């Protein structure tokens, strides 16, 4: 899985996890429980190290395999015992034959306490471990420490707060208040970010406080953290501003002399816990204000509720659906897309027959507001594909807010059919392309059925697809997907077995942050015709002209999604609520400036494959 290969590349993270196991060893901890095991490399330090006992357990089918077969390889079978279980299910004599000096886990999320770390140390002090200091039971990490700062990052705004009443001639009534899933028991408490690339950038608007402190060789304070009064925090703002979210992040004191961090301004890049902040009257804040909150820890992760900034339907969306609502080119464009195939067919009716409205289906996965801008435009009659009732009821109040009567938004749902029996729809817009980077599955299909249900005149939006896509050299998308030797692993063995599973294609990538070197400038791969089903080829060949000598990792790729040939919408564009993918080849190839390299681009269905001839 993903984060397994970063971390066994950070050598200096390994460097500090070996010294602090090491030092406990040295110092009597003799006997060790390494929950979360992994691939089993704490393991492997506690026993290289000199522990004459060592337990590990995971969860994971897959990964309990990967360590037994790795621990075998590097010849500690004998002195590791891998169990392949919960450590809360772990009994005494039964699994593990007496109670162990150490307990090492590194079973944390960006926000601390996502993984269970609490639930599992108060089992491992209550059942597994000698009792404390008063031969006694420590827990690596000893302890930590959890930070936040206020920040401005219109990244985050536009996936969690909608930032227009009106767009593309229509209005968004107040009455219908949009929240994301992190609002507020909440869902999302937080997202996770990676706020050292976060597109845009960030601001602080506070400084860095401490928001707790938790010691995980105290139980009683471990099984406090449940029953905790929450915490009311005010910090004071240092910047003018506009309030997006908390960024949070921790500190680990593994002893008295080593730690780990996942602050945003560390050199490794690790994720924060991000609390977008919502539901406000105003965002904009300024020096001598105090940003207001409650901090607790109750409901089995890090909340932080109650966000104020001193100094009447609710509609919840996903983060895709904020993001959407957000991108004013994508709604402009098809407002324009859309009023031109209508005065093509009928002028009369934009704003021969009076009582025929033009009919309209939007087939989009999920929220859209395509069928009010299209009953804007003309004597249309929009259908919408939304299944939610929540859905339902804010298209409802917007249609309401733009002039409708009642019924002229209809719901399709409440297969692809006529309007009516003896009617054809004027324009259908489908969605190609998934929020992942790829393209969804059965589009040509539905194209194909489209394109029978059509007017004399009629469209299909999009009209046609480009994919595009680059050379470049990223190490740090090889990092990402395979460990790169032994020297990294301090020695162990661990590349050969974890790197038997490698990722072809990487989804839900923000190329606009990508750290890596373009090799050859934006290349057409693959052409979609919806309209025309005959036009689309199988195979092809691309030859691409090398600019820069380097080493070719991987080939992002996006989309242009062509409406008319006058108007196209970008998957790479700043306001783009879709994310990119990358094909990542699993043998990098030396490249040369001046070189001219061949692709074999083979398209089947929604599967696309790219190689280098060569």
Not at 58 to 76: F, G, I, P, Q, R
Not at 294 to 312: A, M, N, P, T
Not at 377 to 384: F, I
Not at 565 to 570: A, V
Request: proline fraction near 5%; aromatic fraction near 8%; hydrophobic fraction near 40%.
């Amino acid at each position: 899985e993903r984060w397994h290969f970063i971390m066994l590349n950070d050598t200096k993270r390994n460097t500090i996890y070996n010294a602090a196991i090491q030092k406990a060893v040295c110092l009597g901890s003799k006997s060790v429980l390494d929950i979360g095991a992994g691939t089993g490399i704490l393991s492997m330090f506690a026993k290289k190290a000199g522990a004459h006992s060592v337990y590990a357990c995971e969860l994971s089918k897959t990964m309990y395999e990967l360590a037994c077969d790795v621990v075998a390889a590097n010849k500690m079978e004998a002195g590791i015992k891998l169990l392949h279980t919960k450590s809360l299910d772990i009994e005494i004599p039964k699994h593990i034959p007496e109670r162990v000096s150490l307990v090492v886990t590194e079973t944390v999320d960006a926000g601390l306490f996502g993984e269970g770390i609490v639930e599992s140390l108060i089992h491992a002090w209550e059942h597994l471990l000698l009792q404390p200091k008063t031969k006694y039971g420590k827990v690596i990490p000893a302890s930590a420490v959890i930070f936040g700062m206020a920040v401005e990052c219109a990244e985050i705004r536009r996936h969690h707060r909608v930032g227009i009443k009106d767009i593309a001639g229509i209005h968004l009534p107040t009455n219908v208040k949009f929240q994301s899933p992190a609002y507020s028991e909440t869902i999302e408490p937080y997202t996770t970010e990676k706020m050292s690339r976060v597109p845009g950038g960030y601001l602080a608007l506070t400084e860095c406080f401490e928001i707790m402190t938790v010691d995980f060789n105290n139980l009683q304070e471990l099984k406090s953290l449940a029953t905790k009064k929450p915490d009311k925090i005010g910090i004071p703002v240092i910047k003018e501003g506009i309030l997006d979210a908390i960024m949070v992040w921790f500190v680990l004191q593994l002893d008295d002399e080593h730690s780990l961090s996942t602050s945003p301004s560390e050199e490794t890049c690790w994720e924060q816990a991000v609390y977008p902040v919502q539901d406000l009257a105003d965002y904009w804040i300024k020096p001598g204000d105090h940003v207001m909150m409650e901090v607790s820890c109750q409901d089995c992760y890090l909340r932080i509720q109650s966000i104020s900034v001193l100094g009447e339907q609710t509609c919840i969306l996903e983060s895709t659906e904020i993001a959407l609502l957000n991108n004013i080119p994508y709604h402009e464009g098809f407002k324009m897309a859309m009023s031109k195939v209508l005065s093509s067919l009928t002028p009369e009716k934009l704003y021969q027959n009076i009582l025929e409205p033009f009919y309209v289906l939007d087939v989009s996965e999920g929220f859209s507001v395509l069928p009010v801008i299209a009953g804007t435009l003309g004597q249309v009659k929009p259908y919408s594909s939304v299944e939610k009732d929540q859905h339902r009821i804010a298209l409802d109040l917007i249609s309401e807010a733009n002039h409708f009567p009642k019924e002229t938004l209809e719901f399709w749902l409440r297969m692809l059919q006529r309007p009516k029996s003896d009617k054809l729809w004027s324009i259908i817009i489908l969605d190609v392309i998934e929020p992942s980077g790829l393209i969804q599955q059965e589009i040509m299909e539905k194209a194909a059925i489209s394109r029978c249900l059509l007017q004399s005149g009629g469209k299909i939006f999009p009209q046609y697809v480009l994919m595009f896509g680059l050379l470049v050299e990223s190490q740090t998308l090889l990092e990402e997907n395979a460990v790169q030797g032994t020297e990294r692993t301090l020695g162990l063995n661990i590349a050969p077995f974890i790197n038997q599973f490698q990722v072809p294609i990487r989804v839900f990538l923000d190329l606009s942050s990508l750290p890596c070197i373009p090799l050859s400038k934006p290349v057409e791969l693959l052409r979609l015709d919806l309209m025309t089903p005959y036009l689309n080829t199988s195979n092809r060949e691309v030859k691409v002209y090398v600019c820069k000598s380097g080493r070719l990792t991987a080939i992002p790729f996006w989309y242009h999604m062509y409406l008319d040939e006058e108007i196209r919408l970008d998957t790479s564009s700043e306001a783009s609520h879709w994310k990119q993918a990358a094909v990542v080849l699993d043998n990098p190839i030396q490249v040369e400036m001046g070189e001219e390299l061949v692709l074999s681009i083979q398209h089947h269905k929604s599967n696309v494959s790219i190689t280098v001839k060569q």
